Structures are given as C-alpha cells and as structure tokens.
Amino acid sequence: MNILAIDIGGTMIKYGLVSFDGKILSTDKIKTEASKGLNNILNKIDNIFKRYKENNPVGIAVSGTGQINGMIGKVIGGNPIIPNWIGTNLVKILEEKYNLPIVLENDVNCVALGEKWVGAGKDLSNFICLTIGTGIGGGILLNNQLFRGENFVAGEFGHILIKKGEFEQFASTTALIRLVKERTGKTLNGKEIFDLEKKEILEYQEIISEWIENLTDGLSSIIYCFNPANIILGGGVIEQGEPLINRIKNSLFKKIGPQFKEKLNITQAKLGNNAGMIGASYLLLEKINKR
Amino acid sequence: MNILAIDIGGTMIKYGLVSFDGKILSTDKIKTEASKGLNNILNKIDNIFKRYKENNPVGIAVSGTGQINGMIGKVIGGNPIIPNWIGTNLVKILEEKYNLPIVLENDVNCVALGEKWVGAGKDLSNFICLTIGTGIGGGILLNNQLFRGENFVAGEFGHILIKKGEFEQFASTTALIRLVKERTGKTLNGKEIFDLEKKEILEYQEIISEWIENLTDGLSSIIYCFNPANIILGGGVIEQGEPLINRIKNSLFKKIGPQFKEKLNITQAKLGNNAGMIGASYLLLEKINKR
C-alpha cells in the first residue's frame, strides 16, 4: 500500500512510490521538456503510471510548478514556462483518465508539507519553510495547517523588497550564480562557487558574504511579519550548511530585535529533493481519509 | 452590564465604559506621564477604577503600549518609555488588586479586534489591519483569530525593508511630516500638509506622492507574504478618507501581480481612535464567556 507521487519541476520530473508512512520506496527521473507543453507532461505522466500501474497505487499525488489552487488542483498563474499549463485542472484530467484520487499542489507547499510530515518539521506545529533555488518561495505552517493565502499565493517571498530590489533577484541561488558571473566572468555551479570559498579565495568570500546579507535582509522582513519560532531552509546551496546555516543565523540576528530572535531557530530541510513527493503524498492521504 | 476599558498611549491614557455590544458609553483622558514609571501607571488605573467602581464593571480591559504577551497580559519589551513597565504581569497584579477579570493586549492588536467586532472587520474572518501614525503596526486576523506570533510580536510591519530603508521611517505619518520638514523647513501636522496639497501647491503634491509610493512599497511586501483579501488602514493621515485610500490602492496595484490584487480590498478603519478600547473589551468578553 503506497502512493504514486510525481514532482513536476521546471527542468526535471521526479517520481516514484511513497509509503503511507512517508517513506520513499523508489524514485526515477525524466526530463520535463517544459517548452513542449501540457500534453507532453500528460504523456510523461501516463508513462509514469504504466510503469507503476501494477503496484496498485491508492492515487496520484502531484507537486507542480506555477501558482496553484491546491484545494481543487488547478494551475491559476505563475510564469508561463509550460504552454497550456496555466488553467489546467490536473485533478480533473487525471481522475477521469485513471479513476483514482488525485491532488495537485504547488512546489513549495509540497516541500513544506513533506518536512512537516517526516522531515525537519516533524516535531513542529508552526514554521516557515523556504526553498532557495532558481527563485525563493515559502510554505507557511500555522496551527498544524498549511496557510495558502486568500488566493492561494501566500508565501511568494521572492517578490518582497530588500534594499537592492526584489528578494529573489539578489538571494536565490540563481542570483548567487549571477553575482559570481558579473564579478568574475565565470559561470559556475552553486557547489563550485562554495568549493572556491572553501579554498579561501578572497573574491568568492566577498560575493558569498554579500549574498548572505541579501538573504537575511529578506528573511528579516518575513520575521517582522510572522514572528515565527522556526524557519526551515532548503534547496540547492543549503546542501552547504550546517556551516551555512550558522552564517545565516549570525547575519540575521544582527538585523532583528530581541523578541524576534530570542526563541527563533533556523534549521535545514531534511528530505532534500524528495520533500515535494512526500508532501504531495501527505496531501493525497488527507484527501482520502479522514473525511 | 459594562466593561471598563483603558487605552494606555505614550502621551495620553483614554478610558471609559464600553457596552457588551461594543458601544462607547463614556470616555475621559488623562496624561500618561510615562517617565514617572509603573507605580504612576498603577495609580492612574486606580483612580480610573475608583471613578467607575459604582457602575460595577464586569472587568478591566487594557490596551497597552510596548510589546505585550496578550495571552497572559504581560509586558515583554518595546521601547523603554515607562520605567519598570517591561516585565510587568499586569493581569496578575490587577486581578489580585481588584478581584475582577483583566486583560492586557498590545495597541494594534486591540485596534484590529475593535475593527473586527463592530468596525471595518465586522464581517471578515481574515484581514490585515495597519495603523499609520507615529510608526506603522499591524494586527493580523486569520480564521477569525488574532495571530500574535510565536513570541507575541507578529505584525511589527514598521521594521520591514523597502528600497529606501525601514518602512516606518518613510511611510508613517511621522515620516511624512519629516519629509515636509526636510524639504520646506516647516513643521506641519498632516491636515496642514494635505490642505496644502488641495491648494495644488506643487511642493506638497510631490512630497505626498513620494510618501504614497513608500507606503505601497511596504504594503506590497506584506501582500506577497500573506496574500490577504482585505487590508484595513487606519491612523494619522488616513483621516483623509476615500480620496487617499483610492490613490493608495492604485499605487499598490501597480506593484503586485494579478493573483494578489484580483480579490484584494483596501478599506478604511471605521472606529478611529476608539478601536483600542473596543478591541480590548472584545478580548475581555472572550475571556469571560465559557461554559
């Protein structure tokens, strides 16, 4: 007894089976080919279903890209990276085709729910969980429930303002890569950039330190709004910490007042790139039972 | 019966009786004299209680200054304007002294609950309420409940960043006055500032327009965090009413995406400077009413 989980990212689709206890049982990967459009993605989903059809999945749980109404499983907006993706009720399409319960939820909410279930939030009822990849987004857990916003787009932290501009444009991993490119002429990986800092090359120390300041600028605005006790950081370059987590703490605590930091902890996501599949599966199980 | 409501500001204390339906029955004012300290505050509360003892109030509901844990009624921080105020467990002290139920809550949470009870939040289960006076603060209502934060200081919106610096420093009424003072040498009250704009004085039109942009910068960050459907603005120059609200709305809608503005209302608080007394009383009634 397992769940067929599908994590549709802008570049990769990761899929496999998740147990009723939130354990990854198997995983695979396939290129999204986002520019080929919705019917491309539905074809890939169909091949995923045949590959697992005889595992008798109780349903299909999908983590998607873009702005999504997760109550009904509809893409309502976001960046137009996949033609005809926006507007799609994937719960509609897949429930009719495969005659199984479906959920569709946006990317960072699934990660947050994954960490809530079996990850860095498993002992928490409240936290803010941010992923730092190509952009910055957040999933908000308040009194044990995901907080989606009145129009399902709460937690789009990447668009808040910091001193330099949009949060995302200066504190995502993409922004870090861009800062290195602007100053050194080199187009590097997040790992490659931090390896160079590990060799104490001054140029990369100054850029990463500047990027950390951009990052804790935006975090402090979030903390003044929410006064959380727990922030969970994930994605990409968070692969780096605990040493990264500590620098982020030190930088942040200089920018927020005593009542905002005295009970505040910042910790690393535990589930890595599986959080999305796990969180989507958590949502599917809520939908199936109770009720 | 009735509720004895006390609104402690940094300069004045406003107090009187509030009905069980949220109606102001009487008000008085007396100087806070903040520098005289906690024992001074307790004396004023005592004289306030003696004046109304013979109406047999069901309890004392206090809107306080500073950072406050409203669940237990203790001052936990803020700017140290009243010696020994911070650390004071006012509910413990007053329930023992007067043997009536007491509540103590921070300023903008009381305003929010006031607007929730009988003001602009009368029919809403979710909203964000900002006061725009000497600083900027907010009370957050989510699923019919005040959202205080894990350490009781959620909603300190004045400290989030905008491109120019701290929100409060460029978008409070104090900031507007300071902007007029820096550009013209004159110290005006805000009515005087907007009166000069109605006279199409170019200098004051340009300053107010710049101040409005500062304000919607900060609001846009709040909207990206919370994706509310209802924002209630009160305090200071919001006295100007609908002509100002509409300009704020137009300025703001240029800065947030369709899913954030499609269902969003900017509305004016209805209760003015009586909201605090009314909301503190709402809180006391919540404490009193159980089976």
Numbering used by the authors:
A (entry chain B), B (entry chain A): 1 to 291
What are the paper's exact sentences on this?
N-acetylmannosamine kinase (FnNanK) belongs to the repressor, open reading frame, kinase (ROK) superfamily of proteins. The salient unifying features of the ROK scaffold are a nucleotide-binding region in the N-terminal region, a strictly conserved catalytic aspartate residue that serves as a Schiff base during phosphoryl transfer and a zinc-binding motif that is implicated in the stability of the active site of the enzyme. Once host sialic acid has been transported across the cytoplasmic membrane (by a two-component sialic acid tripartite ATP-independent periplasmic transport system in F. nucleatum), degradation of Neu5Ac to fructose 6-phosphate starts with the conversion of sialic acid by an N-acetylneuraminate lyase (NanA), yielding N-acetyl­mannosamine (ManNAc) and pyruvate. A phosphoryl group from ATP is then transferred to ManNAc by a kinase (NanK), producing N-acetyl­mannosamine 6-phosphate (ManNAc-6-P), which in turn is converted to N-acetyl­glucosamine 6-phosphate (GlcNAc-6-P) by N-acetyl­mannosamine-6-phosphate 2-epi­merase.
The structure of FnNanK has one homodimer in the asymmetric unit, corresponding to a solvent content of 38%. The monomer structure has an elongated shape and is composed of two α/β domains that are connected by two hinge loops (residues 119–125 and 269–271). Forty residues of the helix cluster and connecting loops of the C-terminal domain create a 1479 Å2 dimer interface stabilized by direct hydrogen bonds and solvent-mediated hydrogen bonds. The conserved residues in hMNK (Asn516, Asp517, Arg477, Glu566, His569 and Glu588) that are required for the coordination of ManNAc are superimposable with Asn106, Asp107, Gln67, Glu156, His159 and Glu168 in FnNanK. Although FnNanK retains most of the consensus motifs unique to the ROK family, the lack of a zinc-binding site with sequence xCGxxGCx(E/D) is evident both in the sequence and structure alignments. We find that despite the absence of a zinc-binding motif in FnNanK, the major structural features that are implicated in enzymatic function are not compromised.
